[PDB]
Design a binder for this molecule. Structure first.
Ligand SMILES: [Mg+2]
Ligand SMILES: [Mg+2]
Ligand SMILES: [Mg+2]
Ligand SMILES: [Mg+2]
Ligand SMILES: [Mg+2]
Ligand SMILES: [Mg+2]
Lengths: 257, 164, 138, 66, 169
RNA sequence: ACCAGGUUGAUUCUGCCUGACGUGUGCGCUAGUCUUGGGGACUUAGCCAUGCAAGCCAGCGAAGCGCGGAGCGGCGGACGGCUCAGUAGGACGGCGAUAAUCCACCCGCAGCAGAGACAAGGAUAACCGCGGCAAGCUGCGGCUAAGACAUGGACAGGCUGCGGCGCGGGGAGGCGCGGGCAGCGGACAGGGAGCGGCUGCGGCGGAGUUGCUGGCCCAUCAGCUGGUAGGUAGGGUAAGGGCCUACCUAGGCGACGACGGGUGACGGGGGGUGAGAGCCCGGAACCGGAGAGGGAGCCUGAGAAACAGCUCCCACGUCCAAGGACGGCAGCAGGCGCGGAACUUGCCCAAUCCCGGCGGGGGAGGCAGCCACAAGACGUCGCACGGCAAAGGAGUGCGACUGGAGGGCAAGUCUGGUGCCAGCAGCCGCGAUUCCAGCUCCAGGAGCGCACAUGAGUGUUGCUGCAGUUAAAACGUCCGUAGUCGGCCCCGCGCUGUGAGGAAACCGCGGGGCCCAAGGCGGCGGGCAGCACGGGAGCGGGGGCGACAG
């Protein structure tokens, strides 16, 4: 129909959430917070389907009432809060710090990280705009915004921002030869090094990526999230490490080569 | 939404072929089936397996015979009873995929525990040895079955015995 | 019209050919709407007007026990043939009977001429129930 | 197969768990919640009443007295 | 009310369109605020999205600049001398955009003689504009849209832009 | 990747009819168990009794006896649900555009006037009384709150005109920002349960416009068009626009099918059926659109031209004390009507989720009931247990029809009746191997038969792939324009490969001992003559031949 859609059907839910067909008619509609709906999952999926702390919404209401959940260092006592890629969920009960990240199966996965890796997160910039009075403040893809950054930070760059401090502590540029994470597409959840950038004046810059295994693929640069320069990875890598093993490789391990 | 479903059986195109109508019934009276639908289910299930193999032998991608062909043969071996393929990747798949096309419907009809009870001389009376399955006397390793079209597997085939 | 750029001419031409196909001709004309008896909807139900004497097509020599029936949904007066021997005495005047086709795509079946529909139920109970005595007419 | 929970206090049990399972163990019935058909008519009468109930019932019986 | 849709229009080929749905507020237009001269009355409208649009119903003065020297005053509007789209709009003295209007010359001639005191050559550069100033005729165009902004701002006509317009009225 | 019966004395054909198979709609007969799904779409977007379906709150907090909960204030009610009338492009799908635009929740940022400021003014509802009135509804008086409505006070953002260099971004600019002169204008006087207001930038969530393109039939619809096509200018709008107006050009579309008509036409994801090319269907889960008896107009709001909002008209219907007052079940059950054709006026928020700042609400939704409507599996009565919101079921645990029997077509030249009657039979046919029974037998089997529609059968619609001497069919001839097709030699475009991006459901595949199965659940794939890159050939362009082309 027309207007702000309050409901969300279960089949219309993103398949990255991994909701079953027969779970119900409706899926939890996310609140309209920091990440886009195509690139987010609610808290209420993670606390019942991933971490399984609550089996019931009554248990889930209690967990967010007592405010033990905390994502990106803020308490966020909302059932449908959209947590997205690179965001860090830190629960002081259980002392469990996790970073939301994709998997090889094209689904969201909670990757357990250290207490020290939880102190920061990575954010891809959206635009760069001078504010009133000459403040050059940039805007990230997850809706965060930071001022007085490095002037070399231009579009499609990822910045390492502190959590407990609102500043940006680290900068990573978008060149060739950078460790990239593929956020959207057929190659979702693949980690590779950028080989070439094709500019395509007018629309849709294309990035050419080969992975660690050597498999080459092409994506849009808007689906390219830098996670490291040539020497280092700025985050921990999840289980499987973004290799996206082929179907014949899945066949060859079962029956021999 | 809705759980999906399918049609297990099909009917023949010419329903009164006197050649077919007794070749059905000897394949039915061998295993003591309830109806022709029980026979036509396995005649369908064997057919699209044969139809699966014929589209793999035609294939240009040799990855397809690797992925789906070994999957088809393991389906024939593990849950089915085929029990002879090595999966070596030394093209014994194509030696065995052309053995898929000679498989009959009776090759699948023997696999049911209605027949497998008779295979170990357990109840001796197939035309009413199903009475023992229907009243829960046959028990596989720890579980009882009242479904005579159970389609026992490779490993389970020895472990059948009567219980009380 | 067999050149590589003749597709719009071939669609224009073969559609005009297809209008001469008799099966497609009825869907194009909408004859199942022009007669609302049995085409668009099965099982027409109507009120019996009189019992009809109609004789079979020769060489066969018999008398089929047809009835005129005025439909409820249309008011159309169509004749319908009664099967199932002796059933014509079990149906009476001002009954409300349901009519079915013959399985002949709108034509007459066998020796009967002109009669394109046949009765199956009288006063919402079937004639197979009355030919053997399974049910009772209210 | 049983999926069973091991709590540490009776108060966290009756708080976290759903109200029907504590009716299974002990039969609390702490909230009556009369019936669904009664609570609908009880609320739907209260909706048309503007003001307090006592002003509305007084004006009603004053007209009923006349 | 008035609409903005082309659902009543014909197509490019001239075919008539069928009108079926009820009118939407997505494409609704309004009356022309035929802004005239008088004491200032602006109409406030909660238009689409709650934003307040002010249209001028009557309008007394306009913030008019002299582009040659970069100074401005709000001189009073006297009459519309020329309107480009219709001469009906100048007969009624309707203040719209691009309407050549006769301004109050008093506030502008005070600074114009003051700069003419220092630079004597200024009057000779465009003699026609300073010809009408001593007669008291000063003309400007509205550049703002008074039905949208609620103001009648513009610039003083000078130069060849002036002799273009005085041939038009 | 199939044919069989039927024109003849017999034959070979053409040819259609019919059988044989799937599918879905209805009927009929019949019926043991379980799981799962579906079910007033078609006719009547027909009419509706009764009940219920959208409410909530934390600011202020009256009555009532600190508790309390009224009203104010706020948020939602524009979502879901239902339906498919309209709609042949205002849709939808694919690819875009918005440098032509607006915005609530929420998120991230910056901020919020010293004014007497240890501070804010008049009200009103609730309430206290007094009433009117059949009812629906409403008046008078008296007081009294604020995160309601004001006052106070302008550092900025903002608006408009003019000026105007740069620095950033973008494919492209006064788009952002800094620097100017004017005219406007404009963000905290809140609270001892967490805070809450307001302004701006950036999102998110929406939304409006919009480009290209694709998709039914009719030529017994061939020309159509006047705001029509364009220009200038203004208006109007959130916003580009003939959107509108003023003046002016004479355009615009069309056999590459305009225009007009038809549709028992919502579109799509898809479904059915076929070896395939195809043909047919898409009411129906998800997405988009549209509607709420027919209409039109609007208020409030961020968002409605809203309908379980208003105003009016129309058509139906109801109550009245005769002054007036009301009703819109294409929400959920249920009734009537319609028809061939479609369930209980059950229980509940337990699950799925939504509104609300939480305790609340939810006929969304689930559970059960009804129905052989469908898929799948399996046969020929009461405790305890078990599960369940609750109950019931699952799980332990004890004490046989339906149709036929001449051929097609499987199975009777058995018995009795019937004697061209009655009847049967899709076709051929019979009048006792065909009627009607009995027996036996056959087919499928808890299902089966029938009708209708559709696909295949059908190379009887023919692109693949028909036929046109005589079977149906070359127009009497010739000219002829669009159309379609077209000689030889010697960057652009078609075509094509890969890739991007593309929802799930579905489908294909693959697992996966739900007891099996249909499944559930998890993997992997496909879709697009749009986009990007690649491509040795093909075509253009231009010369040279001069074709048993002219
Ligand atoms: Mg009062
Ligand atoms: Mg008063
Ligand atoms: Mg319609
Ligand atoms: Mg549809
Ligand atoms: Mg819909
Ligand atoms: Mg002829």
């Amino acid at each position: 129909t027309r207007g702000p859609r309050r409901h969300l059907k279960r089949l219309n839910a993103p398949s990255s959430w991994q909701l079953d067909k027969l779970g119900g008619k409706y899926a939890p509609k996310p609140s309209s917070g920091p990440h886009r709906l195509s690139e987010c999952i609610p808290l209420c999926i993670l606390l019942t389907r991933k971490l399984e702390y609550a089996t019931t919404t009554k248990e889930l209401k209690y967990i967010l009432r007592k405010k033990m959940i905390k994502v990106n260092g803020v308490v966020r006592t909302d059932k449908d809060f959209p947590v997205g890629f690179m965001d860090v969920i830190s629960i002081d009960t259980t002392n469990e710090n996790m970073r939301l990240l994709y998997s090889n199966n094209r689904a969201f996965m909670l990757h357990n990280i250290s207490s020290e890796e939880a102190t920061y997160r990575l954010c891809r910039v959206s635009k760069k705009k001078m504010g009133i009075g000459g403040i050059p403040y940039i805007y990230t893809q997850d809706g965060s915004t930071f001022r007085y950054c490095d002037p070399k930070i231009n579009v499609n760059d990822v910045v390492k921002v502190n959590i407990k401090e609102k500043k940006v502590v680290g900068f990573l540029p978008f060149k060739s030869g950078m460790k990239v994470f593929i956020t959207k597409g057929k190659n979702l959840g693949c980690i590779g090094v950028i080989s070439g950038i094709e500019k395509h004046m007018g629309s849709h810059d294309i990035a050419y990526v080969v992975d660690a295994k050597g498999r080459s693929f092409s994506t849009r640069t808007s689906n390219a999230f830098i996670i490291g320069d040539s020497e280092s990875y700025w985050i921990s890598l999840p289980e499987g490490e973004g290799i996206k093993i082929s179907e014949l490789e899945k066949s060859n391990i079962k029956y021999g080569e | 939404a809705r759980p999906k479903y399918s049609k297990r059986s099909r009917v023949p195109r010419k329903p009164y072929e006197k050649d077919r109508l007794i070749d059905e019934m000897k394949l039915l009276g061998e295993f003591g089936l309830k109806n022709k639908r029980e026979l036509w289910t396995q005649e369908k299930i064997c057919d699209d397996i044969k139809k699966r193999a014929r589209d793999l032998l035609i294939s240009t991608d040799e990855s397809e015979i690797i992925i789906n062909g070994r999957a088809l043969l393991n389906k024939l071996i593990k849950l089915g009873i085929f029990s002879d393929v090595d999966f070596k990747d030394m093209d014994d798949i194509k030696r065995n995929l052309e053995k898929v096309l000679d498989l009959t419907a009776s090759h699948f009809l023997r696999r049911r525990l209605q027949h497998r009870v008779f295979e170990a001389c357990l109840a001796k009376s197939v035309h009413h040895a199903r009475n023992l399955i229907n009243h829960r006397h046959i028990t596989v390793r720890g579980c009882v079955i009242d479904k005579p079209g159970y389609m026992v597997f490779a490993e389970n085939e020895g472990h059948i015995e009567i219980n009380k | 019209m067999k050149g590589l750029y003749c597709a719009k001419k071939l669609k224009r031409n073969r559609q005009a050919k297809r209008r001469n196909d008799p099966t497609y001709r009825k869907r194009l004309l909408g004859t199942k709407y022009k007669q609302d008896i049995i085409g668009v909807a099965p099982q027409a139900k109507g009120i019996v007007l009189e019992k009809i004497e109609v004789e079979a097509k020769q060489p066969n020599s018999a008398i089929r026990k047809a009835v005129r029936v005025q439909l409820i949904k249309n008011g159309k007066k169509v004749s319908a043939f009664v099967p199932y021997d002796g059933a014509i005495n079990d149906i009476d005047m001002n009954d409300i009977v349901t009519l079915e086709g013959f399985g002949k795509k709108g034509r007459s079946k066998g020796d009967i001429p002109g009669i394109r529909y046949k009765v199956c139920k009288v006063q919402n109970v079937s004639l197979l129930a009355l030919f053997r005595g399974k049910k009772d007419k209210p | 197969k049983c999926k069973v929970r091991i709590y540490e206090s009776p108060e966290m049990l009756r708080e976290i768990e759903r109200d029907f399972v504590v009716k299974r163990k002990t039969g609390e019935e702490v909230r009556k919640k009369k019936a669904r058909r009664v609570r609908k008519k009880e609320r739907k009468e209260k909706a048309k009443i503007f003001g307090t109930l006592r002003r509305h019932l007084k004006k009603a019986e004053k007209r009923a007295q006349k | 009310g008035l609409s903005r849709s082309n659902r009543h229009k014909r197509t490019k080929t001239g075919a008539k369109k069928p009108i079926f749905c009820k009118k939407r507020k997505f494409h609704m237009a309004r009356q022309p605020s035929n802004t005239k001269i008088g004491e200032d009355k602006l109409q406030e409208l909660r238009c689409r999205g709650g934003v307040i649009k002010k249209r001028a119903l009557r309008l007394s003065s306009g913030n008019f600049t002299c582009r040659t020297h970069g100074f401005s005053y709000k001189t009073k509007i006297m009459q519309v001398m020329y309107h480009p789209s219709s001469n009906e709009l100048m007969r009624t003295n309707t203040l719209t955009k691009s309407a050549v209007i006769k301004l109050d010359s008093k506030q502008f001639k005070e600074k114009f003689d003051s700069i003419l005191s220092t630079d004597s050559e200024l009057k000779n550069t465009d003699p026609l504009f300073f010809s009408n100033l001593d007669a008291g005729k000063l003309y400007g165009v509205i550049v703002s849209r008074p039905g949208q902004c609620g103001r009648a701002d513009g610039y003083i006509l000078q130069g060849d832009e002036l002799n273009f317009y005085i041939n038009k009225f």
